[PDB]
Design a protein around this ligand. Structure first.
Ligand SMILES: [K+]
Ligand SMILES: [Mg+2]
Ligand SMILES: [Mg+2]
Ligand SMILES: [Mg+2]
Ligand SMILES: [Mg+2]
Ligand SMILES: [Mg+2]
Length: 95
RNA sequence: GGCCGUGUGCCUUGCGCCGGGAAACCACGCAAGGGAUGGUGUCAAAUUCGGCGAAACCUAAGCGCCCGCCCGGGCGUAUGGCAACGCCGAGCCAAGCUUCGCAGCCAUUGCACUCCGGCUGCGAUGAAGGUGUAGAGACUAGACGGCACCCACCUAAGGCAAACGCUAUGGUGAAGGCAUAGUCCAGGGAGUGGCGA
RNA sequence: AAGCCACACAAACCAGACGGCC
């Protein structure tokens, strides 16, 4: 239901039919009206397809995002989020 | 369409070998003989533009030699010619494989930051091979062609095996297609004339 | 020379390696 804090969040269950390039923008701002963003890495692999990694800058932006958007049916399809289990190779990269 | 020969290709055998492969086998120089050269299925597209190369075989302008002297001849000779055929650059190509994109759909609920699921179709693509390369050229097929598989035989790195050894993804099963089987038309057969020596 | 190129054309045959004999 919930997850441990993280400057980025994990979201699943989507209509991959979309364009990686496309979906990335259909989030770029879709998930940024309360905080900044770093990168919405997404893949189409038989593994990563159907999932994305919203990256913020501030924990809060995420703490909130994790709620101000959870369970929301994206493209006539629900949604599932969870703070990331491993702070992205961008944050844990620098700090 | 039979027999002799000439050249180029080709395989077999012998011999030589900086050589590639682990091995078989390929390659390369070369000499001599024509015994031997697997099967089914699939593809039929592109078939364009340029350039180098070239045996035998033809002809003898010039040159050399000779008929003692020019005239005229005779002898030798190819880079003049045909041509089996060896290839390059650029362009394009069926289906099979590379890899990228979209569509059925089949499956996926999957925690990542270096990409990448699977048949089917369309497009692009890359490495082969082909095309350019016939008697001018035109159209059909398919084989000796491309591709998949099967078989026979060879060696066995690797994987397997305690081990004698086992096994291909590897290798042998010619070349022909610079028109092969065909149907066309050319060309000669058999005219005229221009270049030419 | 050989050959080569134009327009013209009767056949069978020859004809897409060459030179010969039949
Ligand atoms: K072995
Ligand atoms: Mg050809
Ligand atoms: Mg052999
Ligand atoms: Mg021929
Ligand atoms: Mg023919
Ligand atoms: Mg020929």
């Amino acid at each position: 239901p919930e997850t441990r804090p993280n400057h980025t969040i994990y979201i699943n269950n989507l209509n991959e039919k979309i364009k990686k390039d496309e979906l990335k923008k259909s989030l770029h701002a879709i998930f940024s009206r309360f905080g900044q963003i770093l990168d919405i890495l997404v893949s189409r692999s038989l593994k990563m397809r159907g999932q994305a990694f919203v990256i913020f800058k501030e924990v809060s932006s995420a703490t909130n995002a994790l709620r101000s958007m959870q369970g929301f049916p994206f493209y006539d399809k629900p949604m599932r989020i969870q703070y990331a289990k491993t702070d992205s190779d961008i944050i844990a990269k620098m700090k």
